Amino acid sequence: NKCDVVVVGGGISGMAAAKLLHDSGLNVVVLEARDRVGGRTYTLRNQKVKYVDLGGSYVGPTQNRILRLAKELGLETYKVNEVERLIHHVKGKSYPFRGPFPPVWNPITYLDHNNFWRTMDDMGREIPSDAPWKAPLAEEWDNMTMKELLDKLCWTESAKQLATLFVNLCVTAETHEVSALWFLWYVKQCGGTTRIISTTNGGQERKFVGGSGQVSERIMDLLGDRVKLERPVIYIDQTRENVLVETLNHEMYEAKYVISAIPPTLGMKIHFNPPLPMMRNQMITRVPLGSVIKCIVYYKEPFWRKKDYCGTMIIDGEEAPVAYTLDDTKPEGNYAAIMGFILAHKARKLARLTKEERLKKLCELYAKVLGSLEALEPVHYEEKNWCEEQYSGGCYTTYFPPGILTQYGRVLRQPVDRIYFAGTETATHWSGYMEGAVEAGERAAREILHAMGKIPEDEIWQSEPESVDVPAQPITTTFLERHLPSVPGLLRLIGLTTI
Amino acid sequence: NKCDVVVVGGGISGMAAAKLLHDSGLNVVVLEARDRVGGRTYTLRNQKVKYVDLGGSYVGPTQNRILRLAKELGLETYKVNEVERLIHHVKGKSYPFRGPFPPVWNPITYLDHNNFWRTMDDMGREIPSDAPWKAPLAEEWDNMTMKELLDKLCWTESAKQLATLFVNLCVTAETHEVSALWFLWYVKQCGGTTRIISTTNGGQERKFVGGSGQVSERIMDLLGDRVKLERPVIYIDQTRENVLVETLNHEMYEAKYVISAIPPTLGMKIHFNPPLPMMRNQMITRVPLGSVIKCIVYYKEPFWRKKDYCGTMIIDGEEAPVAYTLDDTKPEGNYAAIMGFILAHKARKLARLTKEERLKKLCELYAKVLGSLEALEPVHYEEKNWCEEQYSGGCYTTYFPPGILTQYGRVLRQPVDRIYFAGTETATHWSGYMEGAVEAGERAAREILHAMGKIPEDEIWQSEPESVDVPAQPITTTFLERHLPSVPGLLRLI
């Protein structure tokens, strides 16, 4: 029953919050809906795979909070394979390349690709990380879908095609579903377009040895009996002196404060007394999560390396079930695997098939993209459809439809009496990621410490020292990249000269 | 505990369903979250106002199911006052007019205005009521907001701004928030633009004497002790022989079947076992309700009538808190009142003020629009902010953001094992209205009757005879309206 803080949700954010509060000498309890911790991170273990992350997996430079938490728990990272060539597959043809971006030869298309990425970052610098709705043109950009923005920025179909896949891959949603302001914020708060898309020096650089599920599992071992599995929270009562939190099995928990560490829309699963204020009440009906199936196809050997392919494929085409893959082979070089994401409307569409039908379609895709018959000989298959999860709502994270972030964005992490809000969605740096989960979990925990008069106000938001293990090379631009004209800019120059 | 059907929700849809099933001889229970029935309809009574609808209120021709149900319960309608002139307030000036739509005098603006409304109805003709996702251009129309359609279609700012007001008023959401496909479906399934906007011969023609809350209240009286108030449903278990439904106060209800008669997104408040299928699991997080405050200012007399104004105001502009009003005076001519809607973003913005602050702004607005100092002396004020309701989620109804209706639309009323789906959102005619609530409640009830082998499949969807009290007159267009060019059409002719 009685404790200082009830934490709702035993994912990375809630576990990070409970650990901090526990380390500060408080009596904490974690109420987790599932028969496991980790939430949107999940590591399957069996003899065929040894271990595999079916949810969140990748970590990179500038994600210093998740890295410090994992290292303190005794965890280790390894580099995702990007030794050999990446593949860009478009119009049923594959084009090998090196570096983070698929190359473009056509001079007009090159100017258009260059300008697009530059403008994404240009617009990003106008958007405050901690308050996106404060951008000078917040309303104008929020009243617009990402599709509308692509339609007006991209003067070539090639750039529009690549930008569409970029959006699908980043936020597991269609360009027409998401606010332009929101998506521009989301990229900006991950350090920009290059940082977000990169394996080497980016978000996909590394994975944890043994899986990311260990983060939450090892925090559970530290907290012992304080974590309560199979306790979905149904009711929060704040009418009396102590906060009462009721679960589905009719257990009652009494606390001074509560941390909500669940996806914002999943707050709907809780009945509130007194009712939530007007803005939060409506906000939680307006914030869906994206759609993704994560699929891993195992092979006898990482045969793609022999053809000088690292395993990275960027696959454009409506026919392609998977738009993005990475090599998922173990660091020891065994359990050869290709990881792929089925994104947005394709997750919806391909979920109708059987596990066996999906495996078949993926192998047939990889065989064509890699130009390898070997790809038609899988030894094993694992997958996870996050759309069917009652206690996640989707993956990777929450997106904002047009008009919502400016109208409702400011209440996301605004406390409601004695309820404080964590979860990756409330973070200001790598929101949507395991990194943002740690940030938001530890920030929510400190808000409570301040409320109890244990720490000063200026200590609620805490900066993180850079990892020595995973150093961040800075994001650099060239003179040409900065000053090459857009397509309309070149046309302006043509019409002005020839006049 | 043990019954044939548990109905979740004591709104009009749930009550209609329960009444149908009860009259057919089944044991039904209604589980209602609030201390009252009615949901998005609510009739307040005090001696100052006598009675006032603070939620759903208006009914009109073609809404035959709500009219029949209310007539059986002993209810009667009266006509909303539209004898005198309507007012269009544009750029700080009032323009009195007659007929459902404000006149336009600039030739170019006239062509642009004409084309916009015509095109809305043209597009609607290709959208099936029972399956909007089967429209020929469903994906194209669903992937754009109403804002970009208006930007595309309206060559003049005058038309765009009136079209914007129209969207705001119909669906309590911003043009940029909503799918074009969904909005065009919404208008089409109310009988078209003219039918949805009209007072005389449209949706706003009539109100119930004594309030619309009496519909749900009188059905609850007919059901005896079968309606359970302050029983919010928290858990639905379908793993066993009969369905188990748990409430927040720990009570257990067992049934052969369930009707969910709540707004789709409020399905999130229930924990399901087994988990919901994937498409519904994600759908119920993708379907918000609009934002509105309904406000009624009372006066000593209906003074506007003396100046040959009926009370209807169509008010352009960002600064106007209220964009649309109706005379809310009682049929007897006493309790003189003006009803106004504070719509969409204005509802969020003006909720930060006090009740008294909102009253002052409305009175000053009405004084400008009506050209009368008498609007500055209210005798009484009532309001309801529907955004603050845990068990509604907003008003009037559920809107679909771009991409949603085509991807998730068909799951809305698709049964989940032994759970059937009612609620106005699942109706095919006047969805969003009290009428759709009745259609959906009775249809969901008959689906169960068919599942039980009591009626054939062809009796699940039943037609309704036209009301003798509120008959519908046909919607007509003129030759010029149908054949006048658009702005770009007039340009290609030049």
Ligand SMILES: *[C]C1=C([C])[C]=C2C(=[C]1)N([C][C]([O])[C]([O])[C]([O])[C]OP([O])(=O)OP([O])(=O)O[C][C]1O[C](N3[C]=NC4=C3N=[C]N=C4[N])[C]([O])[C]1[O])C1=NC(=O)[N]C(=O)C1=N2/[C]=C(/[C][C]C1=[C][C]=C(F)[C]=[C]1)[C]=[N]
């Ligand atoms: C799903 C996914 C996938 C598939 C993938 C990925 C992901 C995901 N991500 C994301 C992550 O995972 C996240 O962010 C995290 O995890 C979050 O955390 P939090 O905040 O903590 O949350 P969660 O987990 O959900 O938890 C919660 C909890 O709670 C509970 N509940 C509910 N309800 C309730 C409860 N309890 C009680 N009561 C009640 N009522 C639940 O159960 C849970 O447990 C990620 N991340 C990272 O970091 N990384 C990665 O990798 C990931 N992934 C993805 C990504 C990447 C992709 C990309 C690629 C390429 C490019 F270019 C871009 C991008 C990211 N995101």
Ligand SMILES: *[C]C1=C([C])[C]=C2C(=[C]1)N([C][C]([O])[C]([O])[C]([O])[C]OP([O])(=O)OP([O])(=O)O[C][C]1O[C](N3[C]=NC4=C3N=[C]N=C4[N])[C]([O])[C]1[O])C1=NC(=O)[N]C(=O)C1=N2/[C]=C(/[C][C]C1=[C][C]=C(F)[C]=[C]1)[C]=[N]
């Ligand atoms: C809010 C509102 C307002 C302000 C106004 C109006 C409206 C609204 N509307 C709408 C109506 O009302 C609706 O539709 C109805 O009501 C619906 O019904 P239903 O479906 O039945 O649903 P509800 O009510 O919501 O119910 C539900 C129930 O459930 C319950 N819950 C929840 N959750 C739960 C429960 N229980 C148990 N458990 C759980 N968990 C709740 O509580 C409830 O009770 C309308 N309508 C009509 O008809 N009329 C009218 O008038 C109305 N309004 C508005 C309109 C008009 C506007 C306009 C003007 C002008 C122009 F031109 C256009 C438009 C319509 N809409």
Ligand SMILES: CCCCCCCCCCCC[N+](C)(C)CCCS(=O)(=O)O
């Ligand atoms: C000699 C020049 C005459 C040009 C007249 C032809 C009109 C050109 C239309 C091309 C549209 C290009 N997209 C990318 C689709 C939208 C750009 C948006 S924005 O125009 O830059 O605002």
Ligand SMILES: CCCCCCCCCCCC[N+](C)(C)CCCS(=O)(=O)O
């Ligand atoms: C004889 C010269 C030919 C000029 C043709 C005129 C085309 C210029 C369009 C500008 C108006 C833009 N609005 C109205 C906002 C949108 C219209 C979109 S759409 O043109 O119908 O696609």
